[PDB]
Every structure is written in C-alpha cells, then in structure tokens.
Design a protein around this ligand. Structure first.
Ligand code: 4XG
Length: 150
C-alpha cells in the first residue's frame, strides 16, 4: 500500500508530480494531490511565468483547465517539437501527471529537494516523495478524497 510521488524543481512555485512514474492521475486526484502539497493547480499565466524561469518537462500534466507540457527546447519526441506551453488538444484518455503551484516557493528556480507533504491527511498509505536526485521522504497518510480515485 505504497505511492511514489516523483517531484521536480520548482520554478516560480510551479512543479511537476508523477505518481508511480506513470501517467495515472485523474483530474480530481490532481487537485487533491496539489492540496496535499499546500498548492493549487497552476493557471496558464503561472505556468507561462514558470516556463520563463527555466521550467520544462517532457510529460503531459494537468493545470487549471488544460493538460500541458512546458517546453523550452524543441525536441521531436516531446510535445511534437513545440516550444512554449504546449496544450494537449486531442486525447481519448483522462489520466496524466499533474503540475502544482506553491505560492510560498522562491520566485525563480528552486532545485532544492522537497521534504514534506505538509497537508496530507491521516491514512494507511506509505507515501514517498522522490526527488530527481534520489532524496526520499516518506510518511503514512492519504491525499485522495474521491472514492473513484482509490
Ligand atoms: C516518467 N518518465 C518517462 C520520464 C519523466 C521524468 N521523471 C523521471 C523519474 C523521476 C524520478 C524522480 C523525480 C522526477 N522528477 C522524475 C521525473
């Protein structure tokens, strides 16, 4: 009964989270997951500012109202070689990664590790934050509020 949350550097407060390293987060679960990080789904404007500070990924994830990939460098296998905030237009499927926005983060690039899930609630799941440098933090808890997500 274990969940890995792979997290990125923050850029202007925006970061990416993958659950178990596979596309597996619903839109409802995304909101709950950000809430557990004392964060919200980013707006498009927040994401554009994060991009301007150096944020890019090669993964689709939820923001407020869209599923996107921030891209700085063109890469053929990431967002069909686009740059900017690439918006997913057509997909059959509902489960992605998520982006999250924490207003209390530093204003530019913050590539320090994430050390807590401050707003997780009591629960039976071993939740492990996994940083890109391998640093891990674990706690027992839960963050999912919708039954359909568990
Ligand atoms: C999911 N694969 C295909 C590539 C996406 C990059 N992942 C790779 C796995 C990983 C592990 C810890 C932290 C982070 N940010 C990441 C990011």
């Amino acid at each position: 009964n274990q969940i890995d949350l792979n997290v990125t550097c923050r850029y202007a407060g925006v970061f990416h989270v993958e659950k178990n390293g596979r596309y597996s987060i619903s839109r409802t679960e995304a909101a709950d997951l950000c809430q557990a990080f004392n964060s919200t789904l980013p707006t498009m404007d927040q994401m554009k500012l994060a991009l301007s500070k150096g944020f890019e990924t090669c993964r689709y994830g939820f923001i407020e109202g869209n599923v996107v990939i921030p891209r700085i460098h063109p890469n053929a296998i990431c967002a069909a070689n686009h740059t900017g905030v690439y918006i997913l237009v057509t997909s059959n499927t509902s489960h992605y990664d998520t982006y999250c926005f924490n207003a209390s983060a530093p204003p530019e690039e913050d590539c320090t590790s994430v050390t807590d899930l401050p707003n997780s609630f009591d629960g039976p799941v071993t939740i492990t934050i996994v940083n890109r440098d391998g640093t891990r933090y674990s706690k027992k808890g839960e963050y999912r509020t919708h039954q359909e997500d568990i």
